[PDB]
Amino acid sequence: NIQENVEASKSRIKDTDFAKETTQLTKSQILQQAGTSILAQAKQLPNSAISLLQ
Amino acid sequence: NIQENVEASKSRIKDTDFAKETTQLTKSQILQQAGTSILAQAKQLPNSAISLLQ
């Protein structure tokens, strides 16, 4: 019984809430994709204009 | 006569009344089957849920 309780507490502390972790994974994936898209846009938008006006 | 009485007492203390013991045996068999079923249900789905969450 004590081993059962100890393992339950250890899971409470150290184990991973796969629901929360998968949600975080998807959020991080979308954040990285948005960052890459923004970087791709802002690589050309604020530089190629200088060449264009000439 | 004394031996008859002592044998009756010894049977009371030691021998088993097959009704109670067979009832207990059937109850324990049912408990074992129920525990096996609950373990089988509690073995696959609780851990397989996270794989579908992936």
Swiss-Prot record, chains A, B:
Belongs to the bacterial flagellin family. It is found in: Secreted; Bacterial flagellum. V.cholerae is able to differentially regulate the flagellins within the flagellum maybe to produce flagella which are particularly suited for motility within a given environment. A flagellar filament composed exclusively of FlaA is fragile and easily broken. Flagellin is the subunit protein which polymerizes to form the filaments of bacterial flagella. FlaA is required to form a core or scaffold into which the other flagellins are inserted to provide structural integrity. Essential for flagellar synthesis and motility; important for full virulence. This is Flagellin A. The lineage of its organism: Bacteria, Pseudomonadati, Pseudomonadota, Gammaproteobacteria, Vibrionales. It comes from the Bacteria. The chain holds residues 326 to 379 of 379 of the full protein. It comes from Vibrio cholerae serotype O1 (strain ATCC 39315 / El Tor Inaba N16961). Signal peptide: none annotated. Heteromer of multiple flagellin subunits including FlaA, FlaB, FlaC, FlaD and FlaE.
